[PDB]
């Protein structure tokens with residue numbers, strides 16, 4: 001079937017794994033479990049199309065190998081962590097440099113929106129997303145708000161590329 005090679009990137013601890021686990025294993029669980037590299041392959045149906053999501057959940061912390069192979073990128077920061085938002089520029093730049101492309105399927109993800117103590121305003125990330133020509137979607141791995149939204153939108157960006 002059609003396969004979509006999705007890569008989740010972003011600073012350490014923003015909730016990359018948590019987003020992926022919530023998508024594939026329909027659950028969250030608050031716990032500390034740093035990622036080295038993990039692969040989830042799930043047959044889904046998105047907009048009537050049966051497809052295989054091949055998601056690489058990467059380390060925040062050798063990224064050229066996994067980036068090169070990537071079709072679409074979830075670029076994640078956390079709304080309670082200004083550094084991870086500031087770190088967004090570098091991941092996009094590194095993805096452009098390895099993908100030799102101004103325009104790779106990509107979504108900007110503001111995760112942990114369940115949390116009361118916001119330090120990155122939505123307008124702020126919205127303005128940044130617009131300047132990249134990519135969608136901005138806020139998520140909560142905890143409550144699952146926006147999770148399918150983030151990933152399915154990325155799949156849709158890949159289809160429209």
Ligand SMILES: Nc1nc2c(ncn2[C@@H]2O[C@H](COP(=O)(O)OP(=O)(O)NP(=O)(O)O)[C@@H](O)[C@H]2O)c(=O)[nH]1
Pocket residue numbers: 010011012013014015016017018019029030031032033034035036058059060061111112113114115139140141142143
């Ligand atoms: N409140 C809240 N906590 C979250 C959310 N997503 C992740 N967390 C918490 O934030 C911590 C880090 O999550 P994790 O998914 O491991 O982050 P990561 O970016 O994958 N880290 P790594 O780069 O090391 O793999 C954990 O305590 C996790 O439960 C979220 O949406 N809301």
Ligand SMILES: [Ca+2]
Pocket residue numbers: 097098099100
């Ligand atoms: Ca290059």
Ligand SMILES: [Mg+2]
Pocket residue numbers: 015016017018033034035057058
């Ligand atoms: Mg992880």
